[PDB]
Design a protein around this nucleic acid. Structure first.
Ligand SMILES: [Mg+2]
Ligand SMILES: [Mg+2]
Ligand SMILES: [Mg+2]
Ligand SMILES: [Mg+2]
Ligand SMILES: [Mg+2]
Ligand SMILES: [Mg+2]
Ligand SMILES: [Mg+2]
Ligand SMILES: [Mg+2]
Ligand SMILES: [Mg+2]
Ligand SMILES: [Mg+2]
Ligand SMILES: [Mg+2]
Ligand SMILES: [Mg+2]
Ligand SMILES: [Mg+2]
Ligand SMILES: [Mg+2]
Ligand SMILES: [Mg+2]
Ligand SMILES: [Mg+2]
Ligand SMILES: [Mg+2]
Ligand SMILES: [Mg+2]
Ligand SMILES: [Mg+2]
Ligand SMILES: [Mg+2]
Ligand SMILES: [Mg+2]
Ligand SMILES: [Mg+2]
Ligand SMILES: [Mg+2]
Ligand SMILES: [Mg+2]
Ligand SMILES: [Mg+2]
Ligand SMILES: [Mg+2]
Ligand SMILES: [Mg+2]
Ligand SMILES: [Mg+2]
Ligand SMILES: [Mg+2]
Ligand SMILES: [Mg+2]
Ligand SMILES: [Mg+2]
Ligand SMILES: [Mg+2]
Ligand SMILES: [Mg+2]
Ligand SMILES: [Mg+2]
Ligand SMILES: [Mg+2]
Ligand SMILES: [Mg+2]
Ligand SMILES: [Mg+2]
Ligand SMILES: [Mg+2]
Ligand SMILES: [Mg+2]
Ligand SMILES: [Mg+2]
Ligand SMILES: [Mg+2]
Ligand SMILES: [Mg+2]
Ligand SMILES: [Mg+2]
Ligand SMILES: [Mg+2]
Ligand SMILES: [Mg+2]
Ligand SMILES: [Mg+2]
Ligand SMILES: [Mg+2]
Ligand SMILES: [Mg+2]
Ligand SMILES: [Mg+2]
Ligand SMILES: [Mg+2]
Ligand SMILES: [Mg+2]
Ligand SMILES: [Mg+2]
Ligand SMILES: [Mg+2]
Ligand SMILES: [Mg+2]
Ligand SMILES: [Mg+2]
Ligand SMILES: [Mg+2]
Ligand SMILES: [Mg+2]
Ligand SMILES: [Mg+2]
Ligand SMILES: [Mg+2]
Ligand SMILES: [Mg+2]
Ligand SMILES: [Mg+2]
Ligand SMILES: [Mg+2]
Ligand SMILES: [Mg+2]
Ligand SMILES: [Mg+2]
Ligand SMILES: [Mg+2]
Ligand SMILES: [Mg+2]
Ligand SMILES: [Mg+2]
Ligand SMILES: [Mg+2]
Ligand SMILES: [Mg+2]
Ligand SMILES: [Mg+2]
Ligand SMILES: [Mg+2]
Ligand SMILES: [Mg+2]
Ligand SMILES: [Mg+2]
Ligand SMILES: [Mg+2]
Ligand SMILES: [Mg+2]
Ligand SMILES: [Mg+2]
Ligand SMILES: [Mg+2]
Ligand SMILES: [Mg+2]
Ligand SMILES: [Mg+2]
Ligand SMILES: [Mg+2]
Ligand SMILES: [Mg+2]
Ligand SMILES: [Mg+2]
Length: 150
RNA sequence: GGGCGUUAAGUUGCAGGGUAUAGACCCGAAACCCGGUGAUCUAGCCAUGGGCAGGUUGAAGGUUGGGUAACACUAACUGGAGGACCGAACCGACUAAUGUUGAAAAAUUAGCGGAUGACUUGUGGCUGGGGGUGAAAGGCCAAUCAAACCGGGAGAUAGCUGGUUCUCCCCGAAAGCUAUUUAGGUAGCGCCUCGUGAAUUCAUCUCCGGGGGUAGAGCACUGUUUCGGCAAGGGGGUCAACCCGACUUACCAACCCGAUGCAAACUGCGAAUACCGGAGAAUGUUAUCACGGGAGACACACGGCGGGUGCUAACGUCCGUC
RNA sequence: GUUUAUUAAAAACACAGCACUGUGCAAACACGAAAGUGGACGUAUACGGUGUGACGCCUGCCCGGUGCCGGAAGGUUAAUUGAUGGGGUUAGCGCAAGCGAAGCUCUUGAUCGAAGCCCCGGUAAACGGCGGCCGUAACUAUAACGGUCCUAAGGUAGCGA
RNA sequence: UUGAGCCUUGAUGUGUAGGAUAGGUGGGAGGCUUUGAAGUGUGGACGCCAGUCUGCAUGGAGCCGACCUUGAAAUACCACCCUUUAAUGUUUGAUGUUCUAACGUUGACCCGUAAUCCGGGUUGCGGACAGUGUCUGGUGGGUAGUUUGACUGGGGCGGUCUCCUCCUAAAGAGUAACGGAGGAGCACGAAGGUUGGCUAAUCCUGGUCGGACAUCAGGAGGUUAGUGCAAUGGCAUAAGCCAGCUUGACUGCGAGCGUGACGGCGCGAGCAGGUGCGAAAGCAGGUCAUAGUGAUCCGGUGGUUCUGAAUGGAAGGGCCAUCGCUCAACGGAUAAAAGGUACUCCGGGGAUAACAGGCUGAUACCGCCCAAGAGUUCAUAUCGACGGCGGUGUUUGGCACCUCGAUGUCGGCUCAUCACAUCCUGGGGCUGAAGUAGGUCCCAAGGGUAUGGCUGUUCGCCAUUUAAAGUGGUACGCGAGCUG
RNA sequence: AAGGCGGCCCCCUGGACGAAGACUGACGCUCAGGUGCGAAAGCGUGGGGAGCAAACAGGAUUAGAUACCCUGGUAGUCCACGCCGUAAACGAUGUCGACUUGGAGGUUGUGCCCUUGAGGCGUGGCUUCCGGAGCUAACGCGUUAAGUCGACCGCCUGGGGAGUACGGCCGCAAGGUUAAAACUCAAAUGAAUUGACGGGGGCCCGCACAAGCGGUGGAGCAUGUGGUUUAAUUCGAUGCAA
RNA sequence: CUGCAUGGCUGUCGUCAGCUCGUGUUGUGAAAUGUUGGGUUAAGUCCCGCAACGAGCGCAACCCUUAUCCUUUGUUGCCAGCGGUCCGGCCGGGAACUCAAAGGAGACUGCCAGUGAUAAACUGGAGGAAGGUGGGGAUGACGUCAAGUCAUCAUGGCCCUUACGACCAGGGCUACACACGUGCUACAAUGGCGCAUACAAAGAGAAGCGACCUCGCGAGAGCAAGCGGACCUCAUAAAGUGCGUCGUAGUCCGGAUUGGAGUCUGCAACUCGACUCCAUGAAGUCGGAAUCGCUAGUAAUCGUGGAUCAGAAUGCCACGGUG
RNA sequence: UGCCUGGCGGCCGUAGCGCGGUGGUCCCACCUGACCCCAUGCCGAACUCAGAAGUGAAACGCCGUAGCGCCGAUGGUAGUGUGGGGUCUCCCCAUGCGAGAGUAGGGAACUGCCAGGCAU
RNA sequence: GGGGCUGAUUCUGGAUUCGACGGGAUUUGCGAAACCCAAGGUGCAUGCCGAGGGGCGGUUGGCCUCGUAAAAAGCCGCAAAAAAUAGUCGC
């Protein structure tokens, strides 16, 4: 479909409950590479300062060096396109010393790039172990039930 | 009304210039097909007989001894197998020299490889040319092979190359346009010659009418460009040195006006020459036009003039006039 | 060993070994319009063809495409056979144009109709093909790793200006 | 097992009207009852379950028939029989099981015979198979006949092949290049004809959204807008924009003229017939004009005042209108076509290339001119930016002028000449020249001006000497002096 | 003997035990080298190949899953002759001799008793479980000793480096065998004890679920916390237990 | 400032039921028995069996409240009986009762059957207000969380003595875009509205609670008697009950926001309390994942008192009504 | 015959704009209202059909203004057809034709038909 | 050194990035700079030489002054020398 580079390592590391389909504001070469040219969404987080929740973590492979007059770099703070109705939640519940906002996926909608973002906490090894334990234990319990029922 | 006719004599022989089919001015192909001849050279195969001097290496195997229950294994004697080794005859030609109208249309000289086998050789036969054969090189098939030789079609074709032989007199060009599987050929026209007819037909000069829009010139229009005024003012301010910024900071800056230039694809204007028509004398062997017979030719070059292209470079190239 | 007699004797051909394929005999194949012959007076441990070429380690992935084989569920489909439509002719109807039954004709072609092709699968020791792009590790430097466009796969073992 | 004529239609039905399974037109009514009627039941059933062929066990004798709801009169009747159903005798096209007499036998025996060919006889096998003859679909470089264009500042590649607009095009017409610039392979029954009416682009002011922008009112300006399209030439009488009517976007001609070698193309007053608009005078044979396109042959369609192979028709042909070709290589070879040859060959060319020679010198080398400066101040002792003018032919370049009826080109060995823009030696000037030793410039060609490793070298790197191991032309010297 | 051996039948053959009988007369045990056998996997030749199944293909879970799972699938597993000689080749216990309390069996002989039942009393061979003395660090062994001895062979001397490299041998190969050194470390270890944990098992309790009831999360209202802003938003509490 | 030096105090596991010691025994020894196993339970409660025998902290009981009865003593608490009435406990009087607060009796598996191991213990029941702890509260082990407080207080170092110390005025803890937590109002016809009308308990009161009269639509204001309080006040409790009214509605539903003018306490409510009138009438119209408490007078629903307090609860702590 | 007005033409940039103010006794324009018969893709903005209350206010026309637009000499220059030359990417001479722009200057139009209204 | 394909999520001529962040214009209160003024109050100033300024220095020299010139204080610099910055992550 229209799905482009998505971060699933963050999806595993977090248990995000927030889903905003906010868009992104980009320059020319950015959308050039996003259409084809491998914009990378790995290691993504927001940098809310004023009303300026830049997507700080995002890489990209430039299409070419056609724009030779001015030298650009892949490491740019891409801005965000989100409603002020929902921007208050980020103005609020982001500073909890243990809460972050990360980008899950990036896709196309009528030739406009929309990057999904979500609020998460962060999982440390001892709860990932419990999550995997429960995931495998549900399967084991269902298998045991089927074997007992025959 | 328009096209073709209605004026107008043709025909048969002779000779001559053409045209069409027959070879069609002559010499010359590489090539195709058909019918025959070759395996005595060479390539393969079959059948029958010869050749490999001489000198080395010790595998299988067979005995004796040790050893094993029997083997297996081990020591001694015989053994002479190898697409085995060196090297003669024989076969071949890897290197260098000689020679290149030579001794010889592939050899000689001094070296070289195989030399008991996938070897070599004598005799006879078999394999036929779009086929044969080929330890595979497009190699050989009788000094000739990416399709052998003889004869026939056949004097194939050749828009190609060369040649085309006695004399005199008169006239006398082109290397241009169009079309072309066309560009070095050809066909029509432009140009030439001969004959028949025809009008002051044609040419030079003088006068008259008309078209220009090229030189030159100019910026009314389409583009380009410079310095001034009207201005919005910005950019390092001298100065505060943090100021509103006092202010012009070797900067840029819409229209509007005043000047200065450029243009093949600009012309509010605009020549000479070039070209057509009307009138007139003088001169020119009708030099002008129409038809018919016959061609030749469509590879041009230089200089002068106005130019594109090139470097206003070329004995360079492309156009128009002499 | 053989090879271009007569400028190339070699890395060029052959070779034993190995792989695939067809071949049940009146075998495949080849020469022959045919008879017939070779294969072979042989019988799948044999013959022919195609690849590589003693021997040691191996022949890794892919049938997208072209060949080959297996199947005929569906579509198309020759030759063959001939259901209708139309036209010609006229015995006769028509005071006239015009109708016009049989017989003979030219034409369209209803239906039947195999192989083949379309389709499914296998076959690579069949013809063949086997990726680029970016970031990321305690200074430099690289990338174990990940993100993702495409393919049939992205080149394994081994070797390397 | 099996296809339609075939013994029979055993048969179907229905306005929401409904004893409803309606009488073919002409006759509306027993032909039924000995042309065997409703009777009891409850397979199968059409099924709008109101019903319905209701079919069929023992009967031995009446259902209907008026039509009730009626827009249609019972199928209980004479019924070329329907919105449609069925089994067996008539016909034999396939897939099969079985037999031998065709056919085959490179199974066995015997004979001709003395004979592994052949033929005949006997006996077995396969068997209407295989195979062969004609047609036919597929496969089919195993083999054959062929094609693969031109222009081109040598060929190939790149680009072009037709038409139109501007300039080169030198003030009539025409006029070339692989010159500079753009388009065309259409659209429109209105975007045409007539009549009537009308005149923008741009800018300024005022005004509700409304804005650098619309729709309005006034003004500046006069074609700086517009043409269905690219460009040129025009358009105010408007060719530019609307409204009403219409099809002249007609038929057959056509004096004359322009442009082309020709095939051809275009303009055109006016005549005859019939139309449209306008009261009328008058206009209309397409579009403001120039691109919007393709010969011939072969065939298709409709009419024909024709032709009709003895007659009468017909078939066919001709005539008129018209259709089927990115034949774009566009004056179009045929309906039907790609490459390699270093295994090549033939006829030619220096008309046409590569090595050379000639011409010019963009480039190459060298010289000179003015001066921002570098150089502790200081432009010249050395250099010199931004710019310019020249010499040689000397590299890379352009032309194709001699040579393709033959001029052998790279490099290496031997053999040298000449130039001076001189490497050294020789003679001098300046110096940012103290001396030794250096930088630059002038004159001066008398002489000299390496050895080895690398690669086939020229060039170059390296090692070691010398005063240097200098630059060029000599067909980038020299193969009728040598190799390769 | 070990590895190992499972329908039935036949052919050849090795080994073990017992009833009674006679001789042979120390011929007896172990074993460095050496030889032979030797699970499976593996390699060569010639076959076979139903099922299973490395490698491999596809699907699936997962952030990733080159695995566990699913659908296919080659070598292999099978036969004959050959090659290596590796295993947790384990009883982690080298062969033999005799001595040292018992119980419950299993298998297989043999003597005698009234064999009325797999009735009893003795004696042998193999083997299982429990256990006394004894032994061991403990677990545990315990007449088949890990109890006390005798004869012989092999091996061990800290964990890594390493049973690694080199070297000799064997082998077609994979690899096997003999076997170090430099360097680092203060430990590396085994039996058991007490906690703790288990996606180990068993039992039990609590509004912890199951059957309710009402609320919270939805929209203002009264509070505290985090961040924001300010000169301060004074400080502390920051899971259930703020 | 250091609760990462502490004393003291407190939360959690958990009102879970375990945590230990003396002697003896077993194993060289860390250690084990006792504390496991069988019934039983609210429970290491009890019994049985057993290298165990006993004890301590512990799960129970003793402690506080309430559920029945008896007795002692009746004012400010009550009227069985009588008299009168101003019909009112009014007071003479009556000390049985409702009640006041002291001591006892009383529930102890005591008994009766069944079950079990001849036990412990369990099931049912004649009695009782009561049945297995009758119903609630206090009582919180060994110990874990460097758990929270050095800002209640004390305390060891460290830090300042012209300043981190001392005094005063004005602002801030109550704050512009949000999130989270605990409660309240609610959503409506089970309801709000207008007018009558009963049913409680527990507490407070001395510069304090504050009767009555009058002005007040009102918070309240002048007047104030009584009360150190079974006397007098705070303080006609609400839900309900009677009657109409509202008919599923931007509602006579929700009273959040906002404007006008005041009432009480406080030198002084703009930052920053509350009550009262008029009007305005935000949402909402039963709430997504995921969640919280409760097993009987408990969950819900209604009202009141009290703590610090000049005033300020929708919070906290307790009584009750219905249930 | 002279004033001015109307219609049709010739001449179409000395023939056209800007400024000053006049014209009505005539002719024209403005205008009145409008059922007709005609008209607006809405309105008598335009066509018109019935007329003269007023005005020359806008137009139209006339007279002067040199601010403009234009017409533009002589002379000079550029160019060149022929012939002859140099130092030849360009130029000289003998010859005729001789521009464009810019100076001097001109300039506020002439003229033919009828149709009326004016003095004669 | 020269040709062809891409520079299109659309090839087919008309995307509101739905949102925050520039810019426009429309509907609201005001401050002589979003206004143009000396009239109520009836005080001692406009300007005239102005002194160097919070701890330090300074602005058109007057925002702060007055008597015949001096402290200067309404702002700007030193200064606030909380700008040290998601989640995961050792002793
Ligand atoms: Mg020929
Ligand atoms: Mg040929
Ligand atoms: Mg030999
Ligand atoms: Mg040899
Ligand atoms: Mg020789
Ligand atoms: Mg020899
Ligand atoms: Mg030899
Ligand atoms: Mg022969
Ligand atoms: Mg060949
Ligand atoms: Mg060849
Ligand atoms: Mg031949
Ligand atoms: Mg030939
Ligand atoms: Mg011939
Ligand atoms: Mg000839
Ligand atoms: Mg002559
Ligand atoms: Mg030619
Ligand atoms: Mg003549
Ligand atoms: Mg000309
Ligand atoms: Mg002629
Ligand atoms: Mg002629
Ligand atoms: Mg020509
Ligand atoms: Mg020609
Ligand atoms: Mg020629
Ligand atoms: Mg020429
Ligand atoms: Mg010329
Ligand atoms: Mg020239
Ligand atoms: Mg020239
Ligand atoms: Mg030429
Ligand atoms: Mg050899
Ligand atoms: Mg040779
Ligand atoms: Mg044969
Ligand atoms: Mg090979
Ligand atoms: Mg090999
Ligand atoms: Mg392969
Ligand atoms: Mg396939
Ligand atoms: Mg097939
Ligand atoms: Mg078929
Ligand atoms: Mg292969
Ligand atoms: Mg290597
Ligand atoms: Mg004979
Ligand atoms: Mg048969
Ligand atoms: Mg071929
Ligand atoms: Mg073929
Ligand atoms: Mg061919
Ligand atoms: Mg050509
Ligand atoms: Mg011309
Ligand atoms: Mg008109
Ligand atoms: Mg008419
Ligand atoms: Mg046109
Ligand atoms: Mg033709
Ligand atoms: Mg006829
Ligand atoms: Mg016909
Ligand atoms: Mg055609
Ligand atoms: Mg052509
Ligand atoms: Mg030749
Ligand atoms: Mg020539
Ligand atoms: Mg040359
Ligand atoms: Mg020459
Ligand atoms: Mg200087
Ligand atoms: Mg020389
Ligand atoms: Mg010199
Ligand atoms: Mg000399
Ligand atoms: Mg001399
Ligand atoms: Mg030389
Ligand atoms: Mg010579
Ligand atoms: Mg036996
Ligand atoms: Mg041994
Ligand atoms: Mg095995
Ligand atoms: Mg399987
Ligand atoms: Mg599997
Ligand atoms: Mg095997
Ligand atoms: Mg071992
Ligand atoms: Mg072992
Ligand atoms: Mg032994
Ligand atoms: Mg045994
Ligand atoms: Mg034991
Ligand atoms: Mg090893
Ligand atoms: Mg689990
Ligand atoms: Mg006027
Ligand atoms: Mg003049
Ligand atoms: Mg002039
Ligand atoms: Mg002039």
């Amino acid at each position: 479909s229209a799905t482009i580079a998505l971060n699933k390592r963050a999806r595993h590391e977090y248990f995000i409950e927030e889903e905003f389909e906010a868009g992104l504001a980009l320059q020319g070469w950015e959308v050039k590479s996003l259409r084809a040219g491998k914009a990378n969404i790995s290691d993504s987080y927001v940098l809310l300062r004023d009303g300026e929740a830049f997507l700080f973590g995002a890489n990209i492979t430039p299409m070419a060096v056609a724009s030779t007059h001015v030298v650009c770099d892949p490491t740019r703070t891409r801005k965000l396109l989100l409603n002020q109705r929902e921007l208050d939640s980020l103005y609020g519940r982001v500073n909890r010393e243990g809460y972050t906002v990360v980008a899950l996926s990036l896709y196309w909608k009528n030739a406009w790039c929309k990057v999904k973002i979500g609020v998460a906490k962060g999982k440390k090894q001892h709860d990932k172990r419990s999550d995997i334990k429960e995931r495998e234990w549900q399967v084991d319990k269902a298998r045991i039930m089927k074997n007992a029922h025959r």
